[PDB]
Paper text:
The essential and metabolic enzyme adenylate kinase (AK) undergoes large-scale conformational changes in response to binding of its substrates ATP and AMP. In addition to the well-characterized ATP- and AMP-binding domains (ATPlid and AMPbd, respectively), the enzyme has three functional loop segments including the p-loop, the selectivity loop, and the catalytic loop. Here, based on a comparative structure–function analysis of AK enzymes from E. coli and the archaea Odinarchaeota and from human AK1, we found that conformational changes in the enzymes are to a varying degree linked to bending, fraying, or unfolding/folding events of the termini of α-helices observed in various structural hot spots of the enzymes.
A notable and distinct feature between the native and Ap5A-bound forms is present in the AMPbd, where the last three residues Ile73, Ser74, and Leu75 in the α-helix spanning residues Arg59–Leu75 change to a flexible conformation when bound to Ap5A. One key interaction site to maintain the helical form of residues Ile73–Leu75 is a network of hydrogen bonds between the side chain of Arg2 and Ser74, as well as to the main chain carbonyl oxygens of Ser74, Thr77, Asp78, and Ile106. To test whether further destabilization of the helical nature of the segment, by itself, can drive closing of the AMPbd and modulate the activity of OdinAK, we substituted Ser74 for a glycine residue. The crystallographic structure of the OdinAK Ser74Gly variant in its substrate-free (apo) form was determined to be 3.6 Å. Despite the relatively low resolution, it is clear that the overall fold of the Ser74Gly variant adopts the expected conformation with the AMPbd in a typical open conformation. In comparison to the native OdinAK structure, there are only minor structural differences near the Ser to Gly substitution. A glycine at position 74 seems to preserve the overall conformation of the S74-helix and does not initiate the unfolding and translational event that is observed in the open-to-closed trajectory in native OdinAK. The catalytic (k cat) activity of the Ser74Gly variant was found to be 0.1 ± 0.003 s–1 at 25 °C which is approximately a 5-fold decrease relative to that of the wild type (k cat = 0.5 ± 0.2 s–1 at 25 °C). Collectively, the results suggest that there is a network of interactions driving the conformational dynamics underlying catalysis in OdinAK and that the loss of one hydrogen bond to Arg2, as well as the destabilizing energetic contribution of an internal glycine (approximately 4 kJ mol–1 ), is not sufficient to drive the conformational change of the S74-helix during subdomain closure. Hence, the local unfolding reaction in OdinAK, although necessary for the closing of the AMPbd, cannot be provoked by the replacement of Ser74 with a helix-breaking glycine residue.
Numbering used by the authors:
A (entry chain B): 1 to 132, 138 to 196
B (entry chain C): 1 to 131, 138 to 196
C (entry chain A): 1 to 132, 139 to 196
């Protein structure tokens, strides 16, 4: 099965993706931004050295590279988990990480939204910052509801599932959010 | 005029449909799930005996059946009211009840959402059971999701979105149903 | 750059536009409705005299005029700010202000939503009425729907969505308008 996994940045989605790769066999865990970076270096070796360079390209070339990455993802395997972002916040507002072509190509069975509590997100982002912009509770609640609207739109267009995993409850022990999300996702795949 | 009527399950949408079919003339009402069941028995008698059997079909066959059902619905009359669901909850998440083909075929003038209070929905669902047990948060989510789905379908197909508020407390039983029927009629005979 | 500016009616969206047109160089601010009205009197003088007369035209004629106006707007300038409405309320429900052709023609970089507090909007509308009546909940709904419409357009046409918050209390009159103008300018000169 194929699921696009998303959440607000730095909340622990990458932790879940890396931890999913160990526990599931014949499951592909892949980060969309990374494939975009690789194909951008391949097609524009001259310009692209750091992964921030994808910002600078012309939007037509960047969209072409997004399509190429969607193709590379499209044939990988049977079980896929695509780690990307419904939307990223910029000075000009929110911008979608996916283009319609990406979904048409990957043909995902579903979209998964990891919804955390804003306090946990702030504390986790500061924890990771200390280990190596500071948004407010309201900024993050917004970001999450907007991710929700984006996924529902993508579902209405491509007829795929919308699965909202709740991780807003208080942690009884550190890393319980990650474990619960991993277990729900696994439970979901092997149904 | 043509309106797709939706709400969360077991909330009283079917009652409103029955009462509209009674009070309204020159308007024919239909249940999408029932037509899907009929065409599934028609095209696949081997498998389809109960209306839950549609689950077992390959998704390609089920989509073909939805297409055929939409064709008959679109032809059925001039004024329509189609009882369907914006989205249904499954172990894999929410899934839209409509596919784009259904809307392109029926070309509804609008979509109508009956939005209830979760407490009313819980009490009504248990009342009907006596004649899964979701929580207030589950139901608020489901309805907000119905909202997003309807607005998306509107942006794509350039159609109306009418949200009927029934979250206020009932002064007498069956006032929600009455108010909804009256608003829908008022809207139709404009 | 091209931004479609939206908000609920009579909340001060037009004031933000007028003050921006005053403050920004090489910036043209234009109202979609006004171009629609002008081309409607030009092309259909018989029916169109007051700007409400746009109501009476056939929806085909109204759409053709919308296309002609969107053509004119995209043609009209370099730096643009288009004053419109994500959605308008009608007896049949909410209906979107933009058509797909409008966006394809204008190719806006983004959408901007001025989101107010319902009390501020109501009080501002009564202020404007007295100078020459929805409920708080009606307006919260209208705005959540505006939001959903903008997000849908965003997914379909890959444009920005900027939500400017004006629901805090005004410490002095015209602070909402001033803050919005400043945020938008800061955004433009990035
Ligand atoms: Cl019902
Ligand atoms: Cl205004």
């Amino acid at each position: 099965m194929r699921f696009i996994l998303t959440g607000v940045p730095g909340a622990g989605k990458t932790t879940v993706c890396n931890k999913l790769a160990e526990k599931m066999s014949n499951l592909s865990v892949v980060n969309y931004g990374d494939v975009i970076f690789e194909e951008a270096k391949k097609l524009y070796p001259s310009i692209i050295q750091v992964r921030e360079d994808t910002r600078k390209l012309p939007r037509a070339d960047y969209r072409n590279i997004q399509i190429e990455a969607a193709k590379k993802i499209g044939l990988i395997t049977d079980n896929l988990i695509v780690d990307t972002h419904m939307s990223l916040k910029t000075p000009y507002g929110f911008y979608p990480g996916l283009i319609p072509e990406t979904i048409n190509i990957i043909q995902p069975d579903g979209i998964i939204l990891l919804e955390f509590n804003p306090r946990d997100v702030i504390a986790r982002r500061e924890k990771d910052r200390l280990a190596g912009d500071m948004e407010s509770e309201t900024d993050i609640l917004l970001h999450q509801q907007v991710n929700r609207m984006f996924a529902v739109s993508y579902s209405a267009i491509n007829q795929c599932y919308v699965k909202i995993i709740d991780l807003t409850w208080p942690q009884e022990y550190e890393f319980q959010h990650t474990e619960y999300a991993v277990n729900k996702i696994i439970e979901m795949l092997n149904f």
